[PDB]
Amino acid sequence: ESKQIQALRYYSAQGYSVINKYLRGDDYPETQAKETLLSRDYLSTNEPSDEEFKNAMSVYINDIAEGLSSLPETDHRVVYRGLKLDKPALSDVLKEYTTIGNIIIDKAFMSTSPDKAWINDTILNIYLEKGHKGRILGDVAHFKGEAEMLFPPNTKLKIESIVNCGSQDFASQLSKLRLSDDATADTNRIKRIINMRVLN
Numbered sequence: 001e002s003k004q005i006q007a008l009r010y011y012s013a014q015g016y017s018v019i020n021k022y023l024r025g026d027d028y029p030e031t032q033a034k035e036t037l038l039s040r041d042y043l044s045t046n047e048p049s050d051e052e053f054k055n056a057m058s059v060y061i062n063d064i065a066e067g068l069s070s071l072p073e074t075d076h077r078v079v080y081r082g083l084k085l086d087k088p089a090l091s092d093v094l095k096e097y098t099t100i101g102n103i104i105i106d107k108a109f110m111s112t113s114p115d116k117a118w119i120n121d122t123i124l125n126i127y128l129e130k131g132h133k134g135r136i137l138g139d140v141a142h143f144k145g146e147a148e149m150l151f152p153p154n155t156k157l158k159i160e161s162i163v164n165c166g167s168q169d170f171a172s173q174l175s176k177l178r179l180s181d182d183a184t185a186d187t188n189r190i191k192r193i194i195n196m197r198v199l200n
Contacts, residue, residue, distance in 0.1 A: 005140060007060065008067030010040070011109070012150075013142035019061060020108035023153050033057065064109070065152040071135040078127050079112035079134065079149050080177065082120035086191060097122070097194055102159045110134075110151040118180040119189055125177060126157065127197040134198070156199040163193040 011019065015036060021028035034053065037043045042056040085094040096104055114136065117123045128134065134151045141148050163170045173193050179185065 002067060002070065004063045004067035004070065006067070007040070007063035008137075008140055009142065010036075011064045012137065012140060015060075015064065016109065016111075019064070022057065023061070023108045025107070036060070061153070067140075068109075068135050068150055068152055069133070071137070071140065074114075074136050074149075076114045076128060076134070076136075076149060077130075078125065079114050080117035081110075081112045081124040081126065082118040082180070083122040083124060084120050086121045097159060098162050098192070100159055100161065103199070104157050104159065106151070106155045106157070107153055109153060110155045112149045112151070113147055114149050115147045116178040116180055118182075119185050119187060121189060121191045123174070123177060123179075123190060123193045125173075125193055125195050127160075127195070129198065129200055132198050132200050151198075158197045158199055159194060160197055161195045163195070165191050 007015075018029050018033050018036065022033065031046075034043070034046045034048065037048070037053070037056045037060060038046045040060070042060055043052060048056065083097075084090070085097060096102055112124075112126060112134065117125075132151075133155070134149045137148045137150055163173050170193065174187065174190065177193070179187065
């Protein structure tokens with residue numbers, strides 16, 4: 001098993017919790033980032049310089065991305081994601097994702113499912129064209145039995161349409177999605193569907 005796949009396994013288990021905030025330019029767990037770099041030997045101490053830290057994070061991210069890229073391609077042409085976009089703090093994110101024809105860049109690794117969306121205020125219905133960079137994790141995923149298609153950083157997507165709750169159009173579109181039916185599933189929580197397309 002390549003060391004890159006092993007880095008992707010770690011991403012799936014725990015590294016995601018640090019890396020994606022880092023990549024977004026958000027506040028992230030700095031101490032944990034450094035502890036990860038030390039434990040996986042990208043650095044010799046947990047107290048590096050800022051350039052040593054940045055360079056090591058780069059290699060770590062690139063290992064995860066390369067592990068991902070090396071996984072087999074599949075024939076999926078759509079995937080799904082539930083998001084919470086109705087938080088006050090995400091108001092500009094909400095506006096971006098609900099601007100028809102907007103092109104958005106996801107700076108982080110982007111997790112999606114080929115099989116179902118977990119209900120949230122927003123359901124993304126994400127169309128894919130052949131040759132896209134998403135890969136099914138399969139047994140690389142830490143927890144098994146939930147299909148996941150992961151995309152590397154900087155996925156570009158186009159907002160094609162937005163379907164708000166409370167019409168037959170919405171009801172029909174929603175009925176043609178497979179949703180999570182877990183213990184807390186409630187479709188009445190859904191405010192919108194956003195139909196998107198990854199631009200390769």
